[PDB]
Amino acid sequence: VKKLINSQISLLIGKGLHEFDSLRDPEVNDFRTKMRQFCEEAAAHRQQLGWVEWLQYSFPLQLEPNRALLVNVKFEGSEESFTFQVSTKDMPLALMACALRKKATVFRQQPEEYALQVNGRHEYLYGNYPLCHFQYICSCLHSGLTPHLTMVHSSSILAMRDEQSNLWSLEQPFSIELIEGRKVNAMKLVVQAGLFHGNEMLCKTVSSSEVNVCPVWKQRLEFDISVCDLPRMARLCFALYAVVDCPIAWANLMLFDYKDQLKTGERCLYMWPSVLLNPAGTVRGNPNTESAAALVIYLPEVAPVYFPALEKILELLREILERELYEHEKDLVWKMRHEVQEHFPEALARLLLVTKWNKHEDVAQMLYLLCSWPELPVLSALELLDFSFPDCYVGSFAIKSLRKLTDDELFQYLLQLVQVLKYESYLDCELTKFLLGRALANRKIGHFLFWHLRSEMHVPSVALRFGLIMEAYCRGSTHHMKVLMKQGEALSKLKALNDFVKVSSQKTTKPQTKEMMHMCMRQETYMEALSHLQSPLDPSTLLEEVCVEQCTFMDSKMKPLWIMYSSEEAGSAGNVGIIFKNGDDLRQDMLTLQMIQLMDVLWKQEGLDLRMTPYGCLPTGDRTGLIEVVLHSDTIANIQLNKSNMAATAAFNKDALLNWLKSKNPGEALDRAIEEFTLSCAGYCVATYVLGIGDRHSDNIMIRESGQLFHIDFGHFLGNFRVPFILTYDFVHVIQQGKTNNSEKFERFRGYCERAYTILRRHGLLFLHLFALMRAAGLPELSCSKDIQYLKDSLALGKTEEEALKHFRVKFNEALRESW
Ligand SMILES: CN(C)S(=O)(=O)n1cc(-c2nc(-c3nc(C4(c5ccccc5)CC4)n(C)n3)cnc2N)cn1
């Protein structure tokens, strides 16, 4: 029975569970036993949750960050629907009451026993919120479409739930013995070593003797640090390089084990290929024992030595600087450490960075303060997750403060909280426990954590950790694992179909490839596999029947697939599409869209909706991911082609954009589209300036028929070809209602840019903490300090709001002066 569940996890996580046993590692084995138990306890509490608490799990409320409307409501066991005239200020309960009252008159004879499902979607409408607070209601309000909802009784929700049940004495200096190696390079081999506590050295780097390219050393490597002065999270970093300078390989390893004991004696280090000394890199060796270079080293015995328990640890001009600092300034903060705890709690990061981690006496005093430190705000806790703060006690304190994250906030920073797992030193961590816990408490987080892990199973350095986490997750939800398997089955078929599409395009005409895509899709295995699955881009979006005749592929290099769906129940909300792309890395594209989505959220909170189109984009595997189709939209380029026998017949190229709008928004409807275009253009002007998105042209900027402008292809960001502000006459013409001179409309638009820019600037540090946590991903255009600096400069965070708004107008006018 459980053998199949074991076999299913294996196929789903892309790694056989036998591989975890083969290693014969007590860290892997104890992670698996503990996590499985923690995950089963989380699945248990979930099986005894009240029917509303289950809705908050399976279907978490999609709520937005007066005027009456028509709402079509039906029940389960019938096709009979009723169309009401409810208000946007109405709670769902009142609508639930009307549905029950109108059911009573039809059937000739309580709303607290119901939930309003969104037709053909895993989304529901419940809670003490007026209808206009629900994202589905607002999407129906702007598009003028009618909300189709189903009355789902408590027992029918409980049916779902039931059918888804599962020490100070060692004063000697720290030393090692560098024995021999087994590598490849064409010169002499020097092995530089070093001791690290995060980004910083605990003592000066000590090198090896230049031994011939042919390698044996047997050398003694002593460090400028005491054995009792090694912090718990001490990292020993190595670097193999050839010289007559050229790097070869790198390896790191913790001086303490997962059981807190100091490591002894012989250790073989399967090194990772190099591009100086890399302290950020993984403390687990290269899994390719066949082609990897090795480093045998000795950890000399000093006897069993365990790091002291917290009980033994606990037993042992100021304001003007608190807004990169000199040694006298550092000494001040450490002297004033108690006054920091008491009156400046948010300064903890600056106090943690000044403490001497190379002295056990210092660390303990700091830890005594930390154990009595008040909870920091979410923003302050997000800063503490960086590699800059490696201490376990610090790491735990950050999670302790992060527990007040709303499931909404957690979903906005999950990509960063997953990347941060790469910085980890051991498999068993409070971050994993947290991520897993929240994943098992909320299925949307459960879904997205999985895909963020699964999309990296091909990267050897993180394959064990991630594979292990996904396995632990799968223990806490047998049902969801089965649902995630259907997603993997669709994606498996999609890659095979794409592979054919790629070959056929190199051999025949497009209508010929398109018809055989269809033939291949119409097969039993493809028809079943690609149908009735929760979208990997949004688990609430149900990709029901695959609309094969409406499926094509794109002419761009990697021949992306256009997969259109339809649902009877959902009707028009069921008419959804997904773009499968295979060959490019969708990580930056996703991060950029997420950063845009956040900007929209920060703006929407301050009552400003700049009509942004933050379409889904999710990497699912090796250079494989999905893109959300923005239906009823086309590229500026295609609209500018100006085809004959159309309604968009333009005399001048400038008119093409506005003529297009005029045909898609007839009569009075056009006035709306121009405000849509102005608001979205303003938003994307700021977004792309702040983020530094370059290589913009008509082929990667799109328009919705609604008027809404948006951007695609974010392969380049942070000015990586200092990019200027962007302004095109084709857009200014549209903003100015199609008139040569209309400054009333243009100066209102100049306001939209300024306001959006100032709101973002107020959360500059949020973008700074999120990007600094992202560095863990290994994104080539987000690899160092120079990259974070682009954001610091585009957001002018080292200047006041007045000095920044003037400096912005300067960039805005120079973008307007370049506009023809
Ligand atoms: C740069 N890329 C190719 S991409 O990076 O793959 N990418 C596409 C998107 C994307 N596109 C569209 C869209 N595109 C087309 C068009 C079309 C469709 C089908 C066959 C041939 C042409 C180009 C007319 N329409 C009509 N819609 C919608 N929502 C998206 N989210 C985002 N990123």
User: What does each C-alpha distance from 5 to 8, 29, 163, 166, 606 come to in angstroms?
Assistant: 5, 18, 16, 11, 48
Asked if 466 and 451 touch (Cβ cutoff 8 Å), the reply is no
Asked if 650 and 717 touch (Cβ cutoff 8 Å), the reply is no
Buried b (16+ CB within 10 A) or exposed e, 168-206: eebeeebebbbbebebeeeeebbbbbbbbbbeebbbebe
Nearest Cα to 228, choosing from 335, 397, 364? 364
Q: What is the β-pairing status of strands 701-704 and 709-711?
A: antiparallel
> Is the CB of 712 within 6 Å of ligand 1?
yes
Half-sphere exposure (CA, 13 Å, Cβ side) for 610? Answer: 33
Buried b (16+ CB within 10 A) or exposed e, 148-165: bbbbbebebbeeebeebe
User: What does each C-alpha distance from 256 to 177, 184, 197, 227, 307 come to in angstroms?
Assistant: 17, 30, 13, 12, 8
> Is the CB of 703 within 6 Å of ligand 1?
no
∠ CA 46-52-56, nearest 5°, is 65
Nearest Cα to 237, choosing from 199, 210, 265, 209? 199
Asked if 453 and 466 touch (Cβ cutoff 8 Å), the reply is yes
Separation between Cα atoms, residue 312 and residue 667, nearest integer Å? 78
Q: Token pair for residue 383? A: 């800063």
Instruction: Give the position of tokens 């999120």.
Output: 770
> What distance in angstroms lies between residue 626's CA and the mean position of ligand 1's atoms?
12
> Is the CB of 710 within 6 Å of ligand 1?
no
Asked if 760 and 767 touch (Cβ cutoff 8 Å), the reply is yes
∠ CA 641-647-653, nearest 5°, is 35
User: What does each C-alpha distance from 584 to 91, 374, 559, 626, 771 come to in angstroms?
Assistant: 45, 45, 11, 11, 21
Largest CA distance in the chain: 96
Nearest ligand 1 atom, CA 560: 6
User: What does each C-alpha distance from 507 to 502, 510, 522, 774 come to in angstroms?
Assistant: 9, 10, 22, 41
Nearest ligand 1 atom, CA 627: 31
> DSSP label at 652?
S
Q: Token pair for residue 207? A: 């090198």
CB atoms within 10 A of CB 626: 26
> DSSP label at 507?
T
> Is the CB of 635 within 6 Å of ligand 1?
yes
Contacts of 596 (CB under 8 A, 6+ apart): 612, 614, 687, 691
> Is the CB of 633 within 6 Å of ligand 1?
yes
Separation between Cα atoms, residue 265 and residue 111, nearest integer Å? 69
Q: What is the β-pairing status of strands 538-543 and 624-628?
A: unpaired
**Ligand 1, atom 19: closest residue by C-alpha:** 554
User: Alpha helix (H) ranges present in 283-429?
Assistant: 310-314, 318-321, 327-335, 337-343, 348-354, 360-370, 378-384, 392-402, 407-419
Q: Which helix (H) or strand (E) holds 609?
A: none
DSSP helix, strand, coil percent of the chain (3-state; round to 5):
45, 20, 35
Separation between Cα atoms, residue 418 and residue 408, nearest integer Å? 16
∠ CA 632-677-645, nearest 5°, is 50
Contacts of 407 (CB under 8 A, 6+ apart): 60, 438, 441, 442, 444, 445
Which phi and psi (to 5°) does residue 172 adopt? -70, 150
* Count of residues making up the chain: 820
Q: Which helix (H) or strand (E) holds 589?
A: helix 587-605
> DSSP label at 51?
H
Separation between Cα atoms, residue 92 and residue 152, nearest integer Å? 12
Separation between Cα atoms, residue 176 and residue 193, nearest integer Å? 10
**Ligand 1, atom 6: closest residue by C-alpha:** 560
Nearest ligand 1 atom, CA 584: 5
Contacts of 156 (CB under 8 A, 6+ apart): 76
> Is the CB of 677 within 6 Å of ligand 1?
no
Q: Token pair for residue 276? A: 């100086």
Question: Which amino acid type is present at position 348?
Answer: L
User: What does each C-alpha distance from 329 to 12, 323, 389, 560 come to in angstroms?
Assistant: 53, 13, 20, 56
The DSSP line for 79-122 is S-EEEEEEETT--HHHHHHHHHHHHHHHTT--GGGEEEEETTBS
Residues 268, 269, 270, 273: is their CA dihedral positive or negative? Answer: negative
Region class of 127: left (phi > 0), else alpha (psi between -120 and 50), else beta: left
Instruction: Give the position of tokens 């910085």.
Output: 423
Asked if 414 and 442 touch (Cβ cutoff 8 Å), the reply is no
> DSSP label at 794?
H
Asked if 692 and 718 touch (Cβ cutoff 8 Å), the reply is yes
Contacts of 132 (CB under 8 A, 6+ apart): 64, 66, 88, 89, 138, 141
Separation between Cα atoms, residue 601 and residue 609, nearest integer Å? 9
> What distance in angstroms lies between residue 589's CA and the mean position of ligand 1's atoms?
14
Separation between Cα atoms, residue 270 and residue 587, nearest integer Å? 28
> DSSP label at 456?
T
> DSSP label at 357?
T
**Ligand 1, atom 17: closest residue by C-alpha:** 554
Mutate to test the pocket of ligand 1, among 535, 552, 702, 716 (most ligand atoms within 8 A of CB): 702
**Ligand 1, atom 11: closest residue by C-alpha:** 629
**Ligand 1, atom 32: closest residue by C-alpha:** 712
> Is the CB of 75 within 6 Å of ligand 1?
no
Separation between Cα atoms, residue 257 and residue 266, nearest integer Å? 14
Q: Token pair for residue 616? A: 């889904």
**Ligand 1, atom 21: closest residue by C-alpha:** 554
Contacts of 763 (CB under 8 A, 6+ apart): 602
The DSSP line for 661-712 is HHHHS-GGGHHHHHHHHHHHHHHHHHHHHHHT-----GGGEEEETTS-EEE-
Q: How many helices (H) and strands (E) does the chain have?
A: 31, 26
> Is the CB of 581 within 6 Å of ligand 1?
yes
Q: Prior bond to 77 cis, omega within 30? A: no
> DSSP label at 635?
E
> Is the CB of 187 within 6 Å of ligand 1?
no
* 3 state SS of 229: helix
Bridge partners (DSSP) of residue 252 are 237
Q: Which helix (H) or strand (E) holds 239?
A: strand 235-243
> What distance in angstroms lies between residue 700's CA and the mean position of ligand 1's atoms?
9
Q: Which helix (H) or strand (E) holds 543?
A: strand 538-543
Region class of 713: left (phi > 0), else alpha (psi between -120 and 50), else beta: left
Nearest Cα to 137, choosing from 573, 544, 442? 573
**Ligand 1, atom 8: closest residue by C-alpha:** 712
Q: What is the β-pairing status of strands 124-125 and 148-153?
A: unpaired
**Ligand 1, atom 1: closest residue by C-alpha:** 713
Nearest ligand 1 atom, CA 630: 29
Separation between Cα atoms, residue 472 and residue 436, nearest integer Å? 8
> What distance in angstroms lies between residue 701's CA and the mean position of ligand 1's atoms?
10
> What distance in angstroms lies between residue 672's CA and the mean position of ligand 1's atoms?
24
Instruction: Give the position of tokens 């389960």.
Output: 76
Half-sphere exposure (CA, 13 Å, Cβ side) for 276? Answer: 7
Q: What is the β-pairing status of strands 533-535 and 81-87?
A: unpaired
Which phi and psi (to 5°) does residue 243 adopt? -150, 160
* 3 state SS of 270: strand
User: What does each C-alpha distance from 642 to 653, 656, 677 come to in angstroms?
Assistant: 8, 7, 20
Q: Which helix (H) or strand (E) holds 591?
A: helix 587-605
Nearest ligand 1 atom, CA 700: 1
Mutate to test the pocket of ligand 1, among 630, 664, 710, 716 (most ligand atoms within 8 A of CB): 630
Instruction: Give the position of tokens 């897993």.
Output: 436
Buried b (16+ CB within 10 A) or exposed e, 758-769: ebbbebbebbbb
User: Alpha helix (H) ranges present in 120-239?
Assistant: 135-143, 154-162
Nearest Cα to 215, choosing from 177, 179, 239, 245? 179
Bridge partners (DSSP) of residue 701 are 711
| Resolution at which this structure was determined, Å | 2.9
> DSSP label at 36?
H
Nearest ligand 1 atom, CA 555: 21
Mutate to test the pocket of ligand 1, among 554, 580, 584 (most ligand atoms within 8 A of CB): 554
User: What does each C-alpha distance from 399 to 151, 392, 422, 564 come to in angstroms?
Assistant: 39, 11, 16, 41
Q: Token pair for residue 780? A: 């080539």
Nearest Cα to 280, choosing from 406, 425, 175? 425
Give first-to-last CA distance, the chain, whole Å.
71
